[PDB]
């Protein structure tokens, strides 16, 4: 039974005093998230080698509908490490000072990813991602499915999932104030263990 | 104050009878059909020549993000009159006729329908279109904002918003269960006018 996701990393109701509730992260998870998973398993049911292979493996070798299916379960995955009942506020350390010398402060990083997360048009998810040959960081959207580990150079540190069903029980429309209340979440311990390996 | 929208066809609380519910019309109506209308409207504001096309013209001529906002407002107006609290069943006339002689049959036409608005991966819009030349329907999908009006031949009969906002408030993830009531609501009065032209 060939693909499986990790647990919630705070619980079905773990954000629900952040403003993610229990219900938007019950229905993302349990059928957005893992409905892609039942996909994957079965198209993985009569492929032996693709079954055999890791989600990330699938990412960066398989195209259309079996590239999606393991891209959002990889996207998904890291939205949601991507996020803590003990996050928000501004990153310390190594990450800060590499938001600094990459955007020259955190406000500015602060604006160019909103504006990114607010703006992408369609479905889609705002990142931050290393180049791993410069080691500059960068703002970087992808489209529905789309995934920086089909680049070459790009190392996600951090995402906001902005399809619709990511915010619309709790938000409607209203992306913007989504998008907010994902600054009050976003997890910088994930986020600088990504940054340092 | 350059653009503008017709009213819903039949009145917010409409098709509240047959599934989708006043709330979830409100919703797409009042914030994101009409959203459209005001960005656009915001960006007439500064360009004359802009604010004196029409929406189509602007679908045919114009690129990036003020042809999404032009193509989302007749995609928008074209699914409200492509649906209707008198609608549903099977058309009859020159219409069903016309579906016979390009998909054998209404039930395989639907099948075609639905296979395409159920399956359709991330934002869009599944459409009975006509080739004008050949005369020939066919079932065509556009992704995000795309109209069937950027092709030359194509004129469109129906379609169904698959944008996870037309839906969610109702069905949440269920597009399954939405495009059913989509075929409870069709409108084959409006289908049958655009056919005859
Ligand atoms: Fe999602
Ligand atoms: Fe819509």
């Not at 349990?30 to 989600?55: I, Q, R």
Request: aromatic share 14%; net charge negative.
């Amino acid at each position: 039974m060939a693909f499986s996701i990790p647990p919630l990393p705070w619980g079905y109701d773990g954000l629900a005093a952040k403003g993610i509730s229990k219900e938007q992260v019950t229905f993302h998870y349990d059928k957005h998230h893992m409905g892609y998973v039942t996909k994957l398993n079965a198209a993985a049911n009569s492929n032996p080698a693709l079954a055999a292979k890791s989600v990330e493996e699938i990412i960066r070798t398989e195209k259309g509908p079996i590239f999606n299916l393991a891209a959002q379960i990889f996207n998904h995955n890291f939205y949601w490490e991507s996020m803590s009942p003990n996050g928000g506020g501004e990153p310390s350390g190594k990450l800060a000072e590499a938001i600094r010398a990459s955007f020259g402060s955190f406000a500015k990083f602060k604006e160019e990813f909103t504006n990114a997360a607010v703006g992408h048009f369609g479905s889609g998810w705002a990142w931050l991602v290393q180049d791993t040959t410069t080691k500059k960081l960068k703002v970087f959207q992808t489209h529905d499915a789309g995934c920086p580990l089909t680049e070459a150079d790009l190392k996600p540190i951090l995402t906001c999932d902005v399809w619709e069903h990511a915010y619309y029980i709790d938000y409607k429309n209203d992306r913007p104030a989504y998008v907010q209340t994902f600054w009050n979440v976003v997890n910088w311990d994930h986020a600088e263990n990504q940054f340092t390996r």
